[PDB]
Structures are given as C-alpha cells and as structure tokens.
C-alpha cells in the first residue's frame, strides 16, 4: 500500500512543479499523472491557463495546514532529479483537484506509477463534461 508522508512548502515552481523540504532536504517534485499547461514549458513559453494552473496549485500549497506527498511503487525520481509523487494539501490531492478543475490533463501513463489513473480519468471526464476551462 502507498503511504502519505509529510513535507514542508517551500515554493510553487508552476502547475505541475513544487519545490518542497522532504526528510530534511529540499527537492523538486514533478507531480504525477497530470499535465498542466505551462508558464516555463521548454520550448513555447506561457500557454494559455497555465498561469491559471500555475496559481491554483501555489494557492492550493501555500494555503495548507498539511502537506503530504505520496510516492507511487515504480521509480520515485525522473531523469531530471525531481521527485514523482501524488502531493495531499488537507488531505485533498493537487493533481486530482487540477485535474477536476479542467487545469490538467491525464499524462500518459508508465507503469508501474498509474495507482490513482483511473481515479483521475474519472475526473477528467467530468471536467470535460461540465466544459471546464481548457475544456471550454
């Protein structure tokens, strides 16, 4: 069973980035299974609703009492260094409530880290059926 540990904010780095202080250290984390549109994307820049993404995810961090990162049971890193795991605020997740929202999309998906795919479709099939933001 995955298992929820806590961390400290450190900063929002954009929709799909946090840095956070975890076992004492500061780390990049990447969140898992979604994609938002970005504000730093490697090649075009700012797309749209990623500033829109990018500050519901800080208003999301920045406002917990509790944050909680949740690895899944592949590979806990990228090729980047940055951590891959679900992020809890108040036990709520940030990457379903982006997803919820229609500020993310479902990423492709590598196994062994998919636990909460279907989860998160679900979601997305909602955001699109109510015609939310990048779905509007």
Not at 64 to 88: M, N, S
Not at 121 to 133: M, V
């Amino acid at each position: 069973k995955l298992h929820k540990e806590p961390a400290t904010l450190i900063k929002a780095i954009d929709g799909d980035t946090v840095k956070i202080m975890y076992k004492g250290q500061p780390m990049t984390f990447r969140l898992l299974l979604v994609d938002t549109p970005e504000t730093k994307h490697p090649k075009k820049g700012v797309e749209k609703y990623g500033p829109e993404a990018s500050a519901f995810t800080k208003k999301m961090v920045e406002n917990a009492k509790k944050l909680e990162v949740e690895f899944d049971k592949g590979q806990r890193t990228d090729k980047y260094g940055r951590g891959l795991a679900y992020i809890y605020a108040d036990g709520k997740m940030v990457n379903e409530a982006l997803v919820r929202q229609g500020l993310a999309k479902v990423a492709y998906v590598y196994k062994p880290n998919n636990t909460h795919e279907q989860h998160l479709r679900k979601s997305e099939a909602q955001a699109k059926k109510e015609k939310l933001n990048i779905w509007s």
